[model samples]
Target chain A: AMRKQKIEYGNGPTQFHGWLIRDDSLDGVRPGVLVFPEAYGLNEHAIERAERLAQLGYVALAADMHGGGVVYSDTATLGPAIRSLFGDRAEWRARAQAALDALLAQPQVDRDRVAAIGFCFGGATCLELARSGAPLSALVTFHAGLQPPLEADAGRITGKVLICHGAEDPLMKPEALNAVLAELSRDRVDWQLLSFGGVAHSFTNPDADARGAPGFAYNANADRRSWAAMQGLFAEVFA
Target chain B: AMRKQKIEYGNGPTQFHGWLIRDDSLDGVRPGVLVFPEAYGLNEHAIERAERLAQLGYVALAADMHGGGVVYSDTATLGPAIRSLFGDRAEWRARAQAALDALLAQPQVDRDRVAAIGFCFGGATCLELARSGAPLSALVTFHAGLQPPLEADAGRITGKVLICHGAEDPLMKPEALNAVLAELSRDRVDWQLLSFGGVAHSFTNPDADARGAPGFAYNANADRRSWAAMQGLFAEVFA
Candidate 1:
């Protein structure tokens, strides 16, 4: 069962709304996924992902990175928005936590069996949530930044972390990866890193390379391998 | 005139196919745009954006982030693919350059007037191109990461940079903004950062923060303001 709910908070003119994807057949939802959007906000793709998660038996709610009705139509328009939102980590964490709290509050959702997965900005948001010791079973980040905050509650991190990356991604380099790994290691955080070869940034985008849209490209091998990894991880995490 | 071009390189058994959107009825036919996709590759939104650019009198081509025929049905499947591609910076830069070269080589394209705009990963990719000193008139990044690369050749950058951002974006922070600004200043690059307040990540998305999708709100104020900024930037950049 999918129901649309509008959440009004503060004294803002706009109201935050979300889609709750629930399975009527399932007596109780075991795991929940709070899906976050990329720089593009929550478009058809994000909603589709939420439905897919619901199909997979999890009550997935695709959260907005921005409040109310904020989205980007073009790069010039989206660039500043993404830069600004990510510019403040504390606010980012707070917003993400708020979304998580909303998702956990769902009666059908098992609060303890919650996880977060995000794309681009959303990916980083989930990682931040994990670093903040949010009550989650695990966190999966796809092609998101590896820049974990310099100071994190490493000891309080209770969820497993999986970072699936393209072997040739330019945004996150070996040094950056090393930095992320160092932080995770310092905190003794349970984590896994998977790298897909021959794919550029946004490897999952089928039209990236084909359309010759700059550093974008699609690699079937990488896509399949990463999906396999996600399936396997989810099975274990949600088990 | 729209043409289908195929390029096959790297270790792959498949061919990379791309659609080039060209219309000679526009201006002098010197302007071209390389449209980048989100993590899900070249879906409808990308193609639509490319078409819009073409309609605006520029030859536009949607680039592929992953290799041939690798599109995710949802974010869960697409997330890891984007991660892998963004893992390596050099490789990412090379791929983006390759796409630019390919697009510039088009018969009807005015190579000198070449510009690029990307969404999500593509947005970041275009910025990388500008940082790499791609001979471009302008580079527009939407919801892209603004991390100034350590090896960025700011002196070689001859393009005008326009960044459109969401004010309430959860991923970006002030430090990131300062870092980008400092890098640009150090390089003496010409740039502008336009931010839309009260918008979340993907503020351009109409369905943001709708239904049960929390945090993904669509603010009309943000959308209108961002579009206005982009139009102004494009007019000035192309002038």
Candidate 2:
């Protein structure tokens, strides 16, 4: 059996709509997966992915990065919206932390077995949460920009990290990957990088193909593989 | 109705296995799409894509990159096989030209209306065909390594080029993209670069994620968009 709830929660003046999904078949406290959507906030794609996670017998929460019913349909507005949040690292961390707290607040969630995953910009946000020293068991990012706002903050990450990246992606350049690896290595954080060849950003989103951007198309092979990689990480972390 | 046939026609010591697929619904000769497979050779995935092209009312042929009944199930052998072919540009061009000739030899194909598309290594080969001045109507590549074995040969290109790349692909570095663009510009070739943000190499191959390489992953979004882009190019060129 599956259960879904549309819950509203956030900081003052910034009420976010989050979709919580779970499989009732699991008895006691179940492992939770905190999902962060692409730059478009908590849209249908995010919610659908959350539902899928639920079907896998886990409690999944799709977070709304932008509150107040804000959803972007085009890059013209979406780009600025994302930049505004990215510009203020402190606020970004706070918002993500708030979502994390909300997920933990749920009675069905296992506080000690919670993990974080995100796509595109959301993947960067997941790293932001980890940098804030969020008590997550694991962190997984799919086709995300690995560069941190402040490289020094990378030392603050407390959870295991798994980065599922596209090897041919131009946005996440070799330099960016090297920087993340260096920071994680310096902090001695347990991390893994799964680079998919010939894949690009937004590989998980089916709507990416229609975006008319050369580097922003969708890839089915990378989507399935990265999801499997995340599940593998979850199984290990939650074990 | 759809018709498929296994073709064997190439130079001596290298009998190729090309899968020719077409939709018999269309009357008279039709435009042809020459497909170059990944390093694994002419596998099911390549053939399936060819079948799809056929469904779209085109004569599609899945070319055999490696001859002599060669098909690789592991990278250990596949890698070397690709390198050996890549090592000899003349031989590579000869083999590709052979496949193109074979595609043209089909009775259903309209000799004047022909295009080529490839994935990963196959993508590079598509460009090679263009660089060799194959007189193709259009050439499209998905998540391909853009760097050519020889830059001087770019002047020989006679087709409109479309490169569907992953913005975050590590294998297809930013520098490599610039190089290709520069070479194409120098040759005054008509070209377009569709860079998908956050994507990587092998974005079209569903099996990319299981490869476990940091630089390779399958991206369904990119795959779909790239395919659509190719169709759009075909529509324009075949018009």
Candidate 3:
């Protein structure tokens, strides 16, 4: 059986709602998976993704980055909200660390065996978490921005990095991708980049096709193949 | 109860496979809806759209642009295929007209009360069908390219046009959208453009989010709202 809980916890003045999902079928404490939502904050899509991770036999927590009661529907608000987090990298890392602390606090989660994954802006957050030297076994990012806030922070990353990228994504330019690769190599960090051919950004998202943008569209083959790749990485990392 | 049929028909040298869907609950002939496939040819998504239309009490036909057995998974092939058709306007119109003929030939379809709808490449095809002066009651296009091979052909449009667009769609640039608007006005065609804020291309597709593109991510709110707009147009057209 699957179980879900919505818990409110965060630092002063910033109340965060984290959705925790886990399968009671497991005999003991299981590996933890942290889910980060897209730029739109902690919406249904983010919660459902957490549920999916739970179905895969992991205790998953969908972290709330924008605090409680804040949902972004348009770029007018969403863009600025995400930019603010980017501007304040310390606060950004702190909020993510707080969510991690909450996830570790759960009895069902195995503290030592934990991974984090994110989508788009959330994907960048995962990298940020890894850069913050958080004790994570692995970090996976889907179509995320590759530009690190502080390039030197790559040296502090302890987790294995896996980036699922869209080859033609306009937002993730070649220069930016190359920059991340160079940074990872300089630090000798264990990292892998899987770029899907002919695919734009947000390949794992079904609603991409509706965006009507040229560089943005859904590719089913990429979506499935990338998820398989992630599963393969998890199998290795968790083992 | 609902039923489906696989139809095979086309002009010489080009045999197409179309999926026809209708509701047996309907007592007699019903409004006919012609569905155009995306750039990847007639696939499950197109067929499922037809099925949904059937559930709504309409005789829906998911038309194949390419010949039977031809399915594209990558943009390298799909892009050229659609471009080839776009380059050859006469052939494009002929193939679409053939599909319309096949749909109207069905016993369950009410020829006098018919409309056409499409997504991405299919959406552009819908515009082509309208420009070709097909006797459609209405035409609805979702996240489609706005460019036409022959802009002057807008004068030939005989049906009311409904374009469900994504405000942030990178493909449909402001200039391109304005061109279409100018052409429609010059031709005095009855048209309506519903632009969903913060959405990109292929917003109507539930599988869009998987594409992993920032500009192409799915917006459920936009998807539902646009479909509602389409339904409103249908109500007006069918009445």
Q: Write the per-residue lDDT of candidate 2 for residues B1-239, one digit (tens) a residue.
A: 67999898897857888889999888999999999988788888788889999998899989998886477888888888888877887888888898899989999899999999898888889988878888799998888875543756847887778788876678688677777776776766656665554567888888887746876888775686567667766877898
Query: How accurate locally is residue A43 in candidate 1, as Cα lDDT from 0 to 100?
Result: 65
Give me the candidate number with maximum lDDT.
2
iRMS, all models: 16.1, 11.8, 18.0
lDDT, residue B44, model 3: 85
Which digits, one per residue and each the tens of the lDDT, describe model 2 over residues A1-239?
Answer: 57999878886687888989999777899888899988877888888888988988789999988997588887898888788887888888888888898899899998988898998888999998888888988888988986544655756877778787776677899787777766776776766665654567888889877745887878775686578657766876787
For each model in turn, which proportion of the native inter-chain contacts is also found?
Answer: 0.00, 0.00, 0.00
State the lDDT at A228 in candidate 2.
68
Report how far residue A65 has shifted in candidate 1, in Å. 0.5
CAPRI accuracy category, model 3? incorrect
Instruction: Tell me the TM-score of model 3.
Output: 0.50
